Subunit: 122 residues, 4 copies
Amino acid sequence: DEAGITGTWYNQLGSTFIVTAGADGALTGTYESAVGNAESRYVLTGRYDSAPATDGSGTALGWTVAWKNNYRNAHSATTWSGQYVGGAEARINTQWLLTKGTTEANAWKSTLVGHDTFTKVK
Amino acid sequence: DEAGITGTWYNQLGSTFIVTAGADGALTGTYESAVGNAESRYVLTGRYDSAPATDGSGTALGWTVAWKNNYRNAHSATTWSGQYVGGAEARINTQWLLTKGTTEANAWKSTLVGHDTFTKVK
Amino acid sequence: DEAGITGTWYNQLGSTFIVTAGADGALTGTYESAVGNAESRYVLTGRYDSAPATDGSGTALGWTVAWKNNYRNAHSATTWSGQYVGGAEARINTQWLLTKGTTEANAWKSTLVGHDTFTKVK
Amino acid sequence: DEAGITGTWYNQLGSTFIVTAGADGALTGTYESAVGNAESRYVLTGRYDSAPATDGSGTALGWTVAWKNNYRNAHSATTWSGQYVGGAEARINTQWLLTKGTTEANAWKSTLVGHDTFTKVK
């Protein structure tokens, strides 16, 4: 699904996920969040299953953004874990974990959890 | 925390996380899981906050492993999201999401969640 | 939101959530899952914020089902954590954790995570 | 495990979980959090598997606290999902989801995720 995954994707929040899937299982690109302490593009890297099952199952993948770029630093990182589902209306369905750097006293509230669905349109 | 993070880490399960932190915020290395449908090393990539807060807060980071290598393919990917906490007994405290490729009918049970703590010894 | 929450709700999977919100913050009712190792209704109990903010924010709530009834026992429990959002198309948006009873060796894979959205129609 | 679960438990944060397990699978009691926007005791309710497997597996359970009592209202609810593990050093190992009531604009950051381990001492 190298060609299926490679390109520009948009989630329900209007964030933009620009990704290249490599033959070797690599994901590289940029992420622009429509929400939160973020502006412009941030580097992302990740991995995907480059030899998925042929039984109609989705293709497992994940990637990370650390929320530091030349404009801002939100001292946090989000990882999206999900699967790519091919077809006429292709989707990447994910769950994510956003961890902020905290003191030990505040570590219990370090991590947000959510879910993003990415499509090729929007 | 380039030097602080770079090296070999072990979690509570006895898994081995070998990572290089780049000056640019990159994480690269390999992961060997002591449990599950895995053998030998798997490629990982991720990101960390290369300019963390100086108020005693941890350093946010995350990384991904897709569970395909030359030995096995478990048609799944795990993302760890966490923070590095420096000091005499340095730790990387994480939460993770493991997504398996599934049919649409089974998508509701696609994702496991857990928590791993990594230390420099063990 | 006692009256707002009380009633029959359906999620994206076609599961049926029948709930009574008490004046005291209690949730009681039954859950019928359209998927998984389940049949018929299971007891649920939970809590909601009975004096929510008046700034347009949702109403926080949660509930638990242990997957044992007179028909089956799936040796597991799901907790839904979310908020009720009132209005013409009322919704309860949730994230959930499903823990299975496991041996210590398998504890790392004990917990599934997902997200369900409940509406008054469907 | 009615007798095994019933009693007073403490987590790693120093929070106090006082619970009665009913013959029917009910959990009732109070929770006092050592951290966050909380003081004194809050009502909890939940469910557990009252007929667990006899193969050495843990006992699945979950419970909810809405963070409103006579002292404070943090417009949020936490659900703990986990398993009870009996023996000389009994434990309840959990993962939790804390949802705050939010506006629709802030719904993406409504939910914290964490993990608490409860023991009979501490």
